[PDB]
Design a protein around this motif. Structure first.
Motif, PDB file in Angstrom:
ATOM      1  N   UNK A  99      40.559  32.813  38.346  1.00 52.84           N
ATOM      2  CA  UNK A  99      41.811  32.375  38.960  1.00 52.84           C
ATOM      3  C   UNK A  99      41.547  31.692  40.301  1.00 52.84           C
ATOM      4  N   UNK A 100      40.550  32.137  41.053  1.00 50.61           N
ATOM      5  CA  UNK A 100      40.244  31.516  42.340  1.00 50.61           C
ATOM      6  C   UNK A 100      39.687  30.107  42.188  1.00 50.61           C
ATOM      7  N   UNK A 101      38.756  29.912  41.264  1.00 47.97           N
ATOM      8  CA  UNK A 101      38.101  28.615  41.105  1.00 47.97           C
ATOM      9  C   UNK A 101      39.097  27.600  40.554  1.00 47.97           C
ATOM     10  N   UNK A 102      40.045  28.084  39.763  1.00 46.00           N
ATOM     11  CA  UNK A 102      41.111  27.240  39.239  1.00 46.00           C
ATOM     12  C   UNK A 102      42.136  26.852  40.321  1.00 46.00           C
ATOM     13  N   UNK A 103      42.463  27.774  41.221  1.00 48.48           N
ATOM     14  CA  UNK A 103      43.455  27.512  42.274  1.00 48.48           C
ATOM     15  C   UNK A 103      42.997  26.447  43.260  1.00 48.48           C
ATOM     16  N   UNK A 104      41.693  26.218  43.334  1.00 48.71           N
ATOM     17  CA  UNK A 104      41.144  25.113  44.123  1.00 48.71           C
ATOM     18  C   UNK A 104      41.660  23.745  43.677  1.00 48.71           C
ATOM     19  N   UNK A 105      42.139  23.647  42.445  1.00 47.30           N
ATOM     20  CA  UNK A 105      42.714  22.415  41.912  1.00 47.30           C
ATOM     21  C   UNK A 105      44.165  22.627  41.476  1.00 47.30           C
ATOM     22  N   UNK A 106      44.814  23.647  42.025  1.00 55.05           N
ATOM     23  CA  UNK A 106      46.251  23.801  41.847  1.00 55.05           C
ATOM     24  C   UNK A 106      46.739  24.525  40.608  1.00 55.05           C
ATOM     25  N   UNK A 107      45.959  25.451  40.071  1.00 50.35           N
ATOM     26  CA  UNK A 107      46.380  26.183  38.875  1.00 50.35           C
ATOM     27  C   UNK A 107      47.498  27.167  39.158  1.00 50.35           C
ATOM     28  N   UNK A 108      48.085  27.681  38.091  1.00 45.50           N
ATOM     29  CA  UNK A 108      48.919  28.870  38.176  1.00 45.50           C
ATOM     30  C   UNK A 108      47.980  30.012  37.822  1.00 45.50           C
ATOM     31  N   UNK A 109      48.116  31.154  38.479  1.00 46.68           N
ATOM     32  CA  UNK A 109      47.187  32.262  38.253  1.00 46.68           C
ATOM     33  C   UNK A 109      47.343  32.775  36.841  1.00 46.68           C
ATOM     34  N   UNK A 110      48.575  32.832  36.355  1.00 46.28           N
ATOM     35  CA  UNK A 110      48.829  33.354  35.020  1.00 46.28           C
ATOM     36  C   UNK A 110      48.114  32.515  33.964  1.00 46.28           C
ATOM     37  N   UNK A 111      48.126  31.200  34.141  1.00 52.37           N
ATOM     38  CA  UNK A 111      47.464  30.297  33.201  1.00 52.37           C
ATOM     39  C   UNK A 111      45.960  30.528  33.236  1.00 52.37           C
ATOM     40  N   UNK A 112      45.397  30.624  34.430  1.00 51.06           N
ATOM     41  CA  UNK A 112      43.959  30.810  34.571  1.00 51.06           C
ATOM     42  C   UNK A 112      43.508  32.194  34.079  1.00 51.06           C
ATOM     43  N   UNK A 113      44.341  33.207  34.253  1.00 53.39           N
ATOM     44  CA  UNK A 113      44.037  34.556  33.781  1.00 53.39           C
ATOM     45  C   UNK A 113      43.992  34.626  32.253  1.00 53.39           C
ATOM     46  N   UNK A 114      44.867  33.872  31.597  1.00 59.85           N
ATOM     47  CA  UNK A 114      44.879  33.795  30.134  1.00 59.85           C
ATOM     48  C   UNK A 114      43.611  33.139  29.594  1.00 59.85           C
TER      49      UNK A 114
END
Length: 144
Positions: A74-89
């Motif tokens: 979730x952290x590495x994804x949020x660097x490019x604007x993810x939603x945590x729920x999407x990255x956790x899935x």
């Protein structure tokens, strides 16, 4: 946020040149990793797998067990604007991907197998941003 899935892949290969020097992979490995972006034509090679393997150990953004860490995802994804729920899935579909990819003896080969099927899993959920890509993977299955 969906397009972030693609940008996150680019962020993972940001250190590719550094890793190619570490694992001493041929120049051909760089092309084999990028060949997976081709549509319907997707090769598999040990070298492409070792490039992915080395990047994951270069940064150790995994549990030390060699399993994908949910926080790092979730952290590495949020660097490019993810939603945590999407990255956790994405970590959950990595478990589903084990059904499609049994273990391989060589760690590079296992890394590549999971890496391709990781896209196939999000494609089959229809959640990926590239709807024509997931549609083609399901249509190509019907074509044969």
């Amino acid at each position: 946020s969906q397009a972030v899935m693609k940008d996150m892949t680019k962020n993972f290969i940001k250190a590719y040149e550094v890793c190619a020097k570490e694992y001493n992979l041929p120049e051909a490995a760089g092309a084999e990793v990028m060949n997976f972006w081709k549509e319907g034509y997707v090769l598999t090679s040990r070298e492409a797998g070792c490039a992915i393997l080395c990047l994951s150990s270069k940064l150790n953004l995994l549990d030390p067990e060699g399993t994908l860490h949910r926080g790092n995802t979730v952290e590495f994804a949020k660097q490019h604007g993810s939603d945590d729920a999407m990255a956790h899935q994405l970590v959950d579909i990595v478990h589903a991907c084990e059904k499609s990819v049994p273990p391989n003896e060589d760690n590079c080969l296992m890394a590549l197998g999971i890496s391709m099927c990781f896209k196939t899993e999000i494609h089959k959920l229809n959640w990926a941003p590239d709807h024509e890509l997931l549609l083609e993977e399901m249509m190509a299955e019907m074509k044969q």
